[PDB]
Amino acid sequence: IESDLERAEERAELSEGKCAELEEELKTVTNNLKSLEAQAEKYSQKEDKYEEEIKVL
Amino acid sequence: IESDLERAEERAELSEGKCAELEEELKTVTNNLKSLEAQAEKYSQKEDKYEEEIKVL
């Protein structure tokens, strides 16, 4: 039973490590998505401004 | 020892489930990020053309 307990412990440790890595990856990619969405909104506004400038000039 | 082993194995199962869910989230967010990268590239091309026309005018 002691050997069985050791095996269970090591499996749990590996699973937790993988979970932590996945958490970090998701955090990074979600931050990237947020930044890109803000940039896209600003770009739409800039595009409208540029079209207005084209018309007036 | 037997009780501790049972609890450890249950913990490992829970961690594995969490890892699977995290994998799903990561893949979904990755796809969304790629789509928005393409959108931003289109934004960049539009801005380039508008800038050129502004210069000409």
Curated annotation (Swiss-Prot), chains A, B:
Compartment(s) where it occurs, according to its Swiss-Prot or TrEMBL record: Cytoplasm, Cytoskeleton
Residues of the full protein shown: 172 to 228 of 284
Domain of life of the native organism: Eukaryota
Source organism of this protein record: Mus musculus (Mouse)
Modified residues (Phosphoserine): 3, 15, 35
Reported induction: Induced in stimulated quiescent cells.
Family note: Belongs to the tropomyosin family.
Subunit field text: Homodimer. Heterodimer of an alpha (TPM1, TPM3 or TPM4) and a beta (TPM2) chain. Interacts with HRG (via the HRR domain); the interaction contributes to the antiangiogenic properties of the histidine/proline-rich region (HRR) of HRG. Interacts (via N-terminus) with LMOD2 (via N-terminus) and TMOD1 (via N-terminus).
Function field: Binds to actin filaments in muscle and non-muscle cells. Plays a central role, in association with the troponin complex, in the calcium dependent regulation of vertebrate striated muscle contraction. Smooth muscle contraction is regulated by interaction with caldesmon. In non-muscle cells is implicated in stabilizing cytoskeleton actin filaments.
Listed name of the protein: Tropomyosin alpha-1 chain
